Write an enzyme that holds these catalytic residues in place. Structure first.
Site, short mmCIF file in Angstrom:
data_model
loop_
_atom_site.label_atom_id
_atom_site.label_comp_id
_atom_site.label_asym_id
_atom_site.label_seq_id
_atom_site.Cartn_x
_atom_site.Cartn_y
_atom_site.Cartn_z
N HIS A 149 -4.58 -13.77 -9.93
CA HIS A 149 -5.37 -12.63 -9.47
C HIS A 149 -6.54 -12.40 -10.41
O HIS A 149 -6.36 -12.25 -11.62
CB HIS A 149 -4.49 -11.38 -9.36
CG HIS A 149 -5.12 -10.28 -8.55
ND1 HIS A 149 -6.22 -9.57 -8.98
CD2 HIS A 149 -4.84 -9.83 -7.31
CE1 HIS A 149 -6.56 -8.70 -8.06
NE2 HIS A 149 -5.74 -8.83 -7.03
N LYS A 197 0.86 -1.19 0.00
CA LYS A 197 0.00 0.00 0.00
C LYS A 197 0.90 1.24 0.00
O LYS A 197 1.90 1.25 0.71
CB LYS A 197 -1.00 0.00 1.15
CG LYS A 197 -2.05 -1.13 1.04
CD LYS A 197 -2.68 -1.26 -0.36
CE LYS A 197 -3.96 -2.12 -0.32
NZ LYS A 197 -4.50 -2.53 -1.66
MG LIG Z 1 -4.73 -5.27 -4.87
#
Ligand SMILES: [Mg+2]
Ligand SMILES: O=C(O)[C@@](O)(COP(=O)(O)O)[C@H](O)[C@H](O)COP(=O)(O)O
Ligand SMILES: O=C(O)[C@@](O)(COP(=O)(O)O)[C@H](O)[C@H](O)COP(=O)(O)O
Ligand SMILES: [Mg+2]
Ligand SMILES: [Mg+2]
Lengths: 457, 454, 160
Positions: C147, C26
């Site tokens: 993903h 992040k």
């Molecule tokens: Mg992500």
């Protein structure tokens, strides 16, 4: 199976002249209660077209490619087999023969037979057409002589070493040791196990090694040579190391030889170097060979056989040992090994071989040599057109690795001049200091040297 | 050198728990006049960080990676060495270890030392981290069981053969011979030397063999398996053969195994098959191994060591011999070889080994077996989760190769049922006819068989 | 490959090895190489597993060649200090098959002796079966992390 797989009335002279067979000579001892001829015939069968029982699928065409025992001497424990050329595998890609097929048939399953006590190949004959279908060497010692600015014919002795310790030096220390030897010597090679260990990564150490080569070249005014280990399980790992090496050495990349641990690594690794990098000198290292080539061994094949095979495989040079003059297992008669790989015409223990212009494989001498042992070695061989790598003999020198390289060269110049080593020492400091570097060898080879050279307080 | 390359006070238990060393156990005999410890210490040095003299370039860091003799028994002629993990070479491409480095150090130069009479590896221990960095197998016998419609756990006996004669059949004869066995059996493999001989080129014979596989599948309603030899000096030749094989077999290409002569061919050829064609069962053929694995050998390494290595290399299966029940050199204790490559936990001659989920390598039984010899082999081994190729036992059958294949299967069923072979023959014609195909074996194993079977 | 290979690296039972702690870096986009590497180091002091956020690759403000060697330094530093193995899942998603392989090759070379601990992340839904199979067939020995970004456009409870 004697009736089918043996014909002791065939003349060897005819089998050779025909040129349609690879001939192989073995030492052989049958198991207890087994007749000698029946053992030989079973070996011939198991090494070609059959098995230990009759099979419904055998046709008459199959018999035409049967291997045949054409000679046995039970008293001497010798047997000789003729293998038809058509037995051996061929590339679909380019039609060339492959050494792995020769091994599979002639020294494969027959090494594990219950009715055979022992079986070892001593020699083999390759006819003209089969020789034409082997790769053979693409580079030889003359290419190294050319680089060194020495005669491409009889360019003579090439001084060398292996970096010591064999494992454990970090990149900077490793590059420095290389630099030190090259100040006096021609040739450095990786020790056989050194590659990409975590304490000395290739990408780190190799550029530093090249700097050492450049520095030595600039300071000595002589070209230098480096033999790099590219041995690896993965074909593409080998090529990755090779590609990186040549790019790194740039304008000196022709001076990079590629070392392959060919015995434990196998024909696959040797052929990878030979076929993907033919313009780089291919250095065959035979680590492990002693498990079958040892004098005490009655199995597999001899050191002589190994060296002769390597030439066919395309080795530019191969280790042949010190012929009883160092620390491994070898004797003076091993000089025939060098002759077979370097000459165009030579007679082995059982077979004469013509090479029809195939390039010579360099005999590389390594393993416990130093300046003091060399004069005796050269006298036995008859010449010095060799690469001589000496790890202990170099880094073991009391003064410096460079002095060690020099002492090796002075020892050759001594023998070449036919001079007395003790008297030669009186006018060659590096050579003389080798006596004090290896006193135990000095006392044995040259008793009284301390007195004669004035080495005393 | 003894002071540096030996520390006999090191505890093996500690060396194992540490997980920082590969341990290797040897038989060793020193040359005449050479002390045992001094020999062992010299061996450790030549197999790691030094040579036969002192060198100016040695630093203190190098000692941290010295191989150490931690145990010797001069009376029994045993020595054990601890090799620090960092000694062994790593790929620049993907960081994995390579078996050739293990070979170079642990059984390389030390085979030719003048002060050593003989030296042979009996066993070795691989710690967790080194094991994580080996390829290991990508395919195993359960993959074959799945194709054959058998339980992927304990799917049992796989009947097989080698084409006979070992060299010489032309394409049509070769393909026809393949067809005949598959009518009764599961598994066919090239004999070890068969490839692209001029009398039987690959581009000609392989499409005919595939036709034979299809005809047998349609007619038997059973899937069939073929193990093709792709051994070659040139890496790209191997790949040429492999590519052609998979294209030819098309929708059945998953049933093609690749056979590699790994001993004479070397780790290079094995890794080519393993890494470039991982989805194909990799069949390790050990031709030549006897030159060091023989009971008479005191050099190199044993069959057990070879088999354990092959599992690390990524072989889907490997030959382990007939354990004294056939024509090669082997004995009943060789069953431990099968156990080590197929189990997740097993104790070797010197080291216990945990495999941490690495796939098992199939023990492949080959060499002079037939229906009459199998019952004794299974009793010694304890199970039949094996591939059993029998060239002579199949093509040697008086009736047909198919009948031969059936007799092999019936022999397993006999042992599994714990039945008497002579009485079992009375209710199984193919098995019974095997007695007449190999009467000499029959006379030895089952005396009086002629009278009982009429 | 499967989770048991990860359990093995982490030194946990290859059967029922249990919970693997992890995270995504992040901000999802925007960290420069040094900040990115530092964030990775900080999590690994406590956790097992880090993955690229699905869009992070070779943005001009954070080139792969710059950041990946720094991330590896962070992985090594955390391993040395915690005495625990660490795992990294790298995004190799790209239109060009040969771009994917360039990233994969560079990653494995960069991580060197720890390269087995590198997983390859592929945005398989928007990227398609072509990209998934590229990772699977060209790098089978690397853990393949699928993903599914974008999937909600049809898998949503509201979708018919
Ligand atoms: Mg992500
Ligand atoms: O590792 C070694 O022992 C050597 O570097 C010799 O070192 P020294 O010069 O220090 O003795 C060589 O690789 C062996 O001699 C090879 O044996 P061979 O040539 O007989 O195959
Ligand atoms: O070439 C041969 O002789 C065989 O096909 C056996 O044929 P048969 O079934 O006709 O005897 C096998 O390759 C050997 O058994 C290999 O030996 P091992 O498994 O011991 O390495
Ligand atoms: Mg060496
Ligand atoms: Mg065979």
């Amino acid at each position: 199976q004697s009736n089918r797989y043996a014909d002791l009335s065939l003349k060897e002279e005819d089998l050779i002249k025909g040129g349609n067979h690879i001939l192989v000579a073995y030492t052989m001892e049958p198991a207890a209660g087994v007749g000698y001829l029946e053992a030989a015939a079973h070996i011939a069968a198991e090494s070609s077209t059959g098995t230990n029982v009759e099979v419904s699928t055998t046709d008459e065409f199959t018999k035409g490619v049967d291997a045949l025992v054409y000679f046995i001497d039970e008293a001497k424990g010798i047997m000789k087999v003729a293998y038809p050329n058509d037995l051996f595998d061929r590339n679909v890609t380019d039609g060339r023969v492959m050494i792995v097929s020769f091994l599979t048939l002639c020294i494969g399953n027959n090494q594990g037979m219950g009715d055979i006590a022992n079986l070892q190949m001593q020699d083999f004959y390759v006819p003209p057409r089969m020789l034409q279908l082997f790769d053979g060497p693409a580079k030889d010692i003359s290419d190294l002589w050319r680089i060194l600015g020495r005669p491409v014919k009889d360019g003579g002795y090439i001084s060398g070493t292996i970096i010591k310790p064999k494992l454990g030096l970090r990149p900077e220390p490793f590059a420095k040791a290389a630099y030190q030897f090259w100040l006096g010597g021609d040739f450095i090679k990786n020790d056989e196990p050194q590659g990409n260990q975590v304490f000395c990564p290739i990408k780190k150490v190799l550029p530093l090694v090249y700097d050492s080569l450049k520095r030595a070249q600039d300071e000595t005014g002589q070209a230098k040579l480096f033999s790099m280990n590219i041995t690896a399980d993965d074909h593409y790992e080998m090529c990755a190391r090779a590609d990186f090496a040549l790019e790194t050495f740039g304008p000196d990349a022709d001076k990079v030889a590629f070392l392959v641990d060919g015995f434990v690594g196998g024909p696959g690794m040797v052929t990878t170097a030979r076929r993907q990098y033919p313009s780089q000198y291919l250095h065959y290292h035979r680590a492990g060979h002693g498990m079958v080539t040892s004098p005490s061994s009655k199995r597999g094949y001899t050191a002589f056989v190994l060296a002769k095979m390597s030439r066919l495989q395309g080795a530019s040079g191969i280790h042949v040992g010190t012929m009883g003059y160092g620390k491994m297992e070898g004797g003076k008669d091993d000089r025939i090994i060098a002759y077979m790989i370097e000459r165009d015409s030579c007679t082995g223990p059982f077979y004469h071989q013509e090479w029809y212009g195939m390039k010579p494989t360099t005999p590389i001498i390594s393993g416990g040599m130093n300046a003091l042992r060399l004069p005796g070695f050269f006298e036995n061989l008859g010449h010095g057109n060799v690469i001589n790598t000496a790890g202990g003999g170099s880094y073991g020198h009391i003064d410096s690795p460079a002095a060690g390289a020099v002492s090796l060269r002075q020892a050759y110049e001594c023998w070449k001049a036919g001079a007395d080593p003790i008297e030669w020492a009186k006018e060659h400091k590096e050579f003389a200091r080798a006596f004090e570097s290896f006193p135990k060898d000095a006392d044995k080879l040259f008793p009284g040297w301390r007195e004669k050279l004035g080495v005393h307080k």
